[PDB]
Every structure is written in C-alpha cells, then in structure tokens.
Design a protein around this nucleic acid. Structure first.
Lengths: 226, 286
DNA sequence: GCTGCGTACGTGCGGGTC
DNA sequence: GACCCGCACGTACGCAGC
C-alpha cells in the first residue's frame, strides 16, 4: 500500500534531473532531442594529475627517459642525465639503498641530489618505471634542553635537567606565577602570559597536552619567549 | 464514451517516443556497447550529466602510462557531495566499478557522523590535506587523501595495506616496532643498532611521548587522536632522538587490530622509515 | 460559451536473489 | 516457495482558442 512514497521520491529525482540539464548546455522531449544532438559534437589526464600530487616521471634501469620539465623538482636539464648514470647523480647512502632496491610494487623514499623523494613504481622490460613525488627557546617538564637557551641565560645543561621549575627560581614573584600555574594546569587550548623573570624576563606560553586515550593529563610543552 | 479512446491512443504513442529518445541519447557514451545499452533508466541521466561535467570543467583549468605505475586512483568531487570522474583502477582497491559510482552522493558511501569535516573541506576558504574513511555486507575501509581545490577538488587516494601480509620488499632501513594503547613502547626489532643504536632493556614502559621535539609533539598528538578515532594514520614529519642526543628523522603509518571475541581496539603497531642519518651527535637534551 | 495538447497520480505486472 | 523494485497501463485536469 505504501510504495507511493518511494515512487513519489524517485519521480521527484527523475523530474529534477530531466529539468536541470538546461544549465549544463549553453541554450521536454525537445530538450532531450537537442541534448542527444549536443552529445554528437563530443591526454586529458595530465591537466589534473600534474596538478594533483606534483612530481614527474623518470625511468630507471642507466636512466632512459624522464618528463619534459624535471628541473622543476630536481633542477636538472633533459640531456645532462640521458647518457649519464643515475649513480653518478646520487648521494652514496642512497647509492647503496638503490643498489639493494634495484630488483611487485615499490614503496620507497630517496635522498636524491640537486629532495627527499617518495616514489612508487614497478618493473618493466631488467628495467624500471616509477613516478616520483616530493630570543626564544623550546623546552618542557625541565625534562628537556633547548638549543639557544644556554647562550640566553648562561647555564650549561650539566646543571638544569631533571629538576623542578621553582627549585632554582628566585621567589620574588612566585605568587602571581603560582596563580598562573593553577589556571594553566587545567585550561587546555591557548594560555596567554603575564610577567616573570630569572634578572632575565621570560614570558611563558604553556599548552596543556594530554594522551587522548588514558584521559589524564601528564605533560606540558612550553614556547617560552622574552 | 469517446474521450477515453483518443486519450489512450495519444498517450501510448507519446510513451513509446519518450523511451526511444532516452535510449538513443544513452547509446553514444564513453562506455563500451555491451555494458551500457542494458542499464537502468535512472543511471543513464546521471551518467550523461557526469560525462558532460567532466568534459566541461576540465577545460575550465586546462591551458600514456600515468594511471599505471601509480598506487590508487584519481577521484574528484564538488561541494554538493557528488563525485564526477573516477579512475579505471577503482575496481582493484575498493571493489566497485565506475558506472555505479559516477554521480552518486559520497554521503551515501562514507560513514555517517563522520562527514562534517568533509563538508567543511569541500567548501571554499588552495592546499588541502585530510583523512577520510569509505567503503551489501559492506565492511568499512580506510583511505588517505591529498590534492588541490579549484568549485571542485581533485584528490589522490593511497590506501594503507595491513602488515599481517606485506607484499613489499621492506628495506634495511625499515625497522619494526610495537606499541601500547597509550603510546608506550613494548618491543623493538633487532634492526636498530646499526641505524640509531639502543638496547631493548630500556625500550619498555617508558612513555613514547618524550622523544618528540618542539612542535612535533603538538602535531603528533593530533595524529594519535586521529588513529584513536579512525583506524589508521600517516604522520607527516617528526624526529626521535638517539642514545647520544640529537634528532633522527622517522615516518610512520600505523594500524589498529580488532578481536574475534571482542569489539574494542586491542593492539596498535607502527612501521618505521629511517630517513636521515644521526644528526647533532654530541649535544644531548634529556 | 465548450474541444486536443501537455501533466499529474494511482495501480498492477512482472524480473532477480536469497 | 517467495519479497522488493522498475517499468508500464490506466485515468482526472491547466491551457487556447471558433
């Protein structure tokens, strides 16, 4: 009794598709007649797949063939690599790599020379075919030692790691920093700043980070600035 | 007594003429003869409109072995949730052909309440990357997406295999490891000493969220919760320190198992790509 | 003031797939 | 030994004029 609904909906789709074609043509059996007429005047893939994942085609063995503009991503001409060995074009670590990787599918990286190239392909004749494709510091607890901080606050990492923040901090404004510490403890997301020092004003930004499974916050990660 | 006869005769002729015009418009199609002329009426309209669009908006931005020697397929969509063109290799990485999937809604093949992100991606704002899961007794499947947006979007699709059966020659700089649910080490392969040089006696319940550096942690947190919500993940760029300090670059593509007796996500494991050699040899950070 | 083209809606009849 | 769907067969009407 109640198939009227499904047939009404399919009729609605039918009339919508038979009625909206007028946009896609530059102009209702008349419409279908002119459309089947319009169909009569009916390497397209490059125009998207060159734009789709970058990269360019090269073939391995010497090397035999590449695309037209390979210098876009590798910076080499077209005749300076044909008749020229790929081994005398690469870094030695990748040389041993590709020697091991010479001889169904191939998921592999490269460290090629003018550049870390993820490339996939398959064998053909022996020979190969494969597409290619291309005043602050940071530490946290301080479990971690940054790079430029030891030139900033004049302290070697033989005196800092594995201790609490306020163990060595001068407690002349430990109170407002304490208030900030309480608020940033459970704030998550973005936490702004207020003043702090060492003698050397450091203006901390802290980001509450948390394992998305165990549901209990463990670590933070600062991006301390001046 | 005289109205019905005229009405029925005229109606019969009009019915016949309409169906015949339909079929002839169907005939000239990109599809071959055999598998196009014996289809349902609903697909003819959408297939023809899809061909018209994929031959129209192809010249909007326009001016032999690219499909093969390529892992996956090329898809393309618009903001209304409807793919237009699909590559011919689609019949080997998700199970279906082009003709049934060439104008239907992506919303009817994706996972519901997993599409607000897609509906946000498809709308306007040039470089968009994301993740997406997609397909009878249909089992769900995982997928990775890249590409550039026109308003349309041309996408690349590279699914992840399952390391239970690995059809690829893993290289000498591709060591294996296993992890626990909360990103905590459990096991390392014996390929590590030549590459970065640890000992397994330390590779234990120590939390894995210690070796990441600077913004690597704040991005791999999103990658980890992506593996938590989805099934898989592919991480972008990150490092993992060595026995004497400094960063060495690694990349991963994770996975999640299920249980014949249960329904939870039981075990996770990674695959590692050694990318650069040991760097910043002397200086230490932990 | 009343008759043929274009239109909308209800009903059955018959082909796969489990 | 059948259930759900697609295609076909029926009519009760908006419109233009002699």
């Amino acid at each position: 009794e109640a198939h009227s609904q499904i047939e009404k909906r399919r009729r609605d789709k039918m009339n919508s598709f038979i009625d909206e074609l007028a946009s896609l043509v530059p102009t209702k059996l008349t419409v279908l007649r002119m459309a089947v007429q319009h169909m009569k005047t009916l390497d397209e893939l490059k125009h998207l797949i060159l734009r789709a994942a970058d990269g360019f085609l090269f073939v391995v063995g010497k090397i035999l063939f590449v695309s037209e503009s390979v210098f876009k991503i590798l910076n080499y001409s077209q005749n300076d690599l044909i008749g020229q060995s790929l081994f005398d074009y690469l870094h030695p670590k990748d040389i041993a790599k590709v020697k091991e990787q010479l001889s169904a599918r191939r998921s592999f990286f490269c460290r090629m020379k003018c550049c870390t190239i993820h490339s996939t392909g398959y064998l053909k004749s022996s020979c190969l075919v494969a597409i290619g494709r291309l005043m602050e510091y940071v530490s946290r607890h301080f479990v971690f030692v940054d790079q430029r901080a030891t030139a900033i606050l004049a302290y070697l990492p033989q005196e800092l790691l594995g201790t609490s923040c306020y163990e060595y901090f001068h407690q002349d404004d430990i109170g407002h920093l304490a208030e900030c510490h309480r608020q940033v403890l459970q704030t998550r997301e973005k936490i702004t700043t207020n003043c702090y020092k060492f003698f050397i004003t450091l203006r901390s930004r802290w980001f509450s980070f948390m394992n998305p499974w165990t549901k209990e916050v463990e670590y933070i990660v600062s991006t301390n600035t001046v | 007594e005289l109205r019905k006869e005229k009405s029925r005769d005229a109606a019969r002729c009009r019915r016949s003429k309409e169906t015949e015009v339909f079929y002839e418009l169907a005939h000239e199609l990109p599809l071959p003869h055999s598998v196009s002329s014996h289809l349902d009426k609903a697909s003819i309209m959408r297939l023809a409109i899809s061909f018209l669009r994929t031959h129209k908006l192809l010249s909007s931005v326009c001016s032999n072995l690219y499909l093969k020697a390529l892992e996956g397929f090329i898809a393309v969509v618009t903001q209304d949730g409807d793919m237009i063109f699909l590559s011919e290799n689609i019949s080997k990485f998700m199970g279906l052909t082009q003709v049934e999937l060439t104008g239907h809604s992506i919303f009817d093949f994706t996972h519901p309440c997993d599409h607000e992100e897609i509906r946000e991606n498809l709308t306007l704002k040039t470089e968009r990357d994301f993740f997406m899961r997609m397909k009878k007794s249909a089992t769900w499947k995982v997928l990775h997406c890249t590409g550039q947006v026109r308003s349309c979007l041309i996408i690349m699709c590279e699914p992840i295999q399952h390391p239970s059966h690995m059809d690829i020659p893993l290289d000498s700089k591709t060591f294996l490891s296993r992890h626990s649910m909360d990103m905590k080490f459990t096991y390392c392969d014996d390929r590590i000493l030549e590459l970065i040089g640890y000992h397994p006696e330390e590779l234990l319940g120590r939390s894995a969220y210690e070796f990441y550096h600077a913004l690597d942690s704040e991005n791999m947190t999103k990658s980890h919760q992506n593996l938590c919500t989805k099934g898989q993940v592919v991480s972008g760029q990150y490092r993992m320190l060595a026995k004497h300090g400094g960063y060495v670059w690694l990349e991963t593509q994770g996975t999640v198992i299920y249980n014949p007796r249960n329904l939870q996500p039981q075990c996770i494991m990674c695959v590692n790509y050694v990318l650069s050699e040991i760097e910043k040899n002397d200086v230490v950070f932990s």
